[PDB]
Symmetry: C2
Subunit: 101 residues, 2 copies
């Protein structure tokens, strides 16, 4: 499948609606979100996709970390996408920094 | 010193005048040039500063490669800047890809 959906991204202030594809890997999703939320920051001074995690803030109140590979990936392993996780259009998401230590 | 100057950057079409500081390292100069010349390309799909070299296209007709460290660096080594190379305001420059093999 190759379809667009919208994610409502929490500001790193109002949420920002960002278009991505349902077939983008989670790393590719994170890249598009960073492009939107840090649009006026030079590339050199933006956080990198690989240093951040995507957090799905469900209507249930659960906050789930989505990534390219986890316990939900089926083994050749296909990289995880929003379609893999069945994320609905309009879902609320945040980017969360990774602990370095 | 901490002063601005303009470089006239060859399109990767007309040259693009880009502001940088005379104390920016050459890597920092390259980053600012990339920000200008690829402004509408997402960060993910831009060439990286470290994979490109800065070429000074002198009025003499000479084309010189400038970089953070070379035979002109004096030894603790300070990283090279445009002031180090005595590049005049308004100089013409290009970004050149590095051979990978």
């Amino acid at each position: 499948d190759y379809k667009t959906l919208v994610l409502s991204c929490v500001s790193p202030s109002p949420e920002v609606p960002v278009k991505i594809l349902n077939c983008d890997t989670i790393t590719q999703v994170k890249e598009k979100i960073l492009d939107a939320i840090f649009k006026n920051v030079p590339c050199s001074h933006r956080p990198k996709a690989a240093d951040m995690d995507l957090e799905w803030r469900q209507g249930s109140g659960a906050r789930m970390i989505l990534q390219d590979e986890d316990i939900t990936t089926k083994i050749w392993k296909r990289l995880n996408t929003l379609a893999h996780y069945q994320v609905p259009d309009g879902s609320v998401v945040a980017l969360v920094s990774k602990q370095v230590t």
